[PDB]
Symmetry: C2
């Protein structure tokens, strides 16, 4: 029915927040679940070797580079289009999320850090009124998603204190309706976050 | 490996991409399985794969519909693919071999023949094959797949071409393709971007006539 599509959405989400380790084996009603996993294989959100079990993809440096290069263009496009549509209520909700992010970093909750970051940025991009652009960005997040698992393994959230500052600057740039400033702030955010991710190589 | 499901999926992507399926059309899984001489299973899965990327919509009673592509949606898809295709073409320049260029020249001849013969489907298809052959040399498979994905999404918007556009009025449109190939041969990055942008602008202008 429409259950299998929902199972797929749930797995895409787990992949996106780095909840699944690269190379890990996923153990599969079971029928629509298996159907969702095979559909995810077909878009390379998951891997399978012939006649064997589903696995979380391995994302090498070259592939992460390619993904970052593409989303760089798309996410900066989204933020530039969102600037002109953000309402006072939008900005207030973004400030709230930024406070949630600070809490997560202070609590040392890496799960919440990743999740709040996701919602903060997606909340911005959605306000661009470009739903297809946002679809494309989420697809890329799913592909680089297994690359985020490293955060849980090696990264101490205490060393992420200064990283929240670029978020305040982005929100300030959004509040000031400064389009080019938003692009610079978002590029800075992506750059610093990717630098953390590259340590796994 | 060859999968029946993948084969149906790629054929449906191709049909969508070249404008062979009309916006809003109701696709019946059973009809398609009968037409392909296949079990329902790989046909239904292929259709659901397209639903999962929003290339098709779910319809009542084991069926699907081809999405409606309004000007607003075509606008968004064009804006997105504009950046991606220009990025693809610029990266492909430093990797194109004499052999690559030779095959691009052959595709261009096919395109001219298609326009002279008045074969609208072949015109559309060869344009696709030509640009994709270029993009593949960017060595960015995910970028190329995403570009193909966006062509699938705008695809139903091309159905208008078969009914309303006289292929004879597209004669002069092939010159931009010659110019693009020359720019690729001369390794001129900005010239490639400019020619490809011109190609897209003129082709899009034709598509917008359907919303009048």
């Amino acid at each position: 029915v429409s259950l299998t599509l929902q199972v797929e959405n749930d797995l895409k989400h787990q992949l996106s927040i780095g909840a699944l380790k690269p190379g890990a084996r996923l153990i599969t009603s079971i029928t629509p679940v298996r159907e969702a996993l095979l559909r995810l294989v077909s878009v390379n959100a998951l891997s399978v070797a012939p006649a064997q079990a589903f696995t979380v993809p391995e994302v090498g440096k070259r592939q992460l580079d390619e993904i970052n290069r593409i989303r760089y263009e798309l996410e900066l496009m989204a933020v530039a289009l969102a600037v002109e549509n953000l309402t006072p209520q939008d900005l207030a909700e973004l400030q709230e999320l930024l406070e949630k992010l600070q809490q997560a970093q202070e609590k040392g909750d890496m799960e919440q850090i990743i999740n709040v970051n996701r919602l903060f940025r997606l909340a911005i991009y959605h306000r661009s009124n470009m739903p297809i652009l946002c679809e494309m960005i989420e697809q890329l997040w799913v592909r680089m998603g297994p690359g985020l698992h490293y955060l849980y393994e090696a990264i101490n959230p205490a060393e992420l204190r200064e990283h929240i500052e670029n978020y305040h600057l982005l929100l300030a740039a959004l509040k000031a309706k400064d389009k080019e400033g938003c692009r610079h702030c978002l590029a800075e955010i992506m750059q610093q976050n990717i630098a953390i991710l590259y340590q796994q190589y």
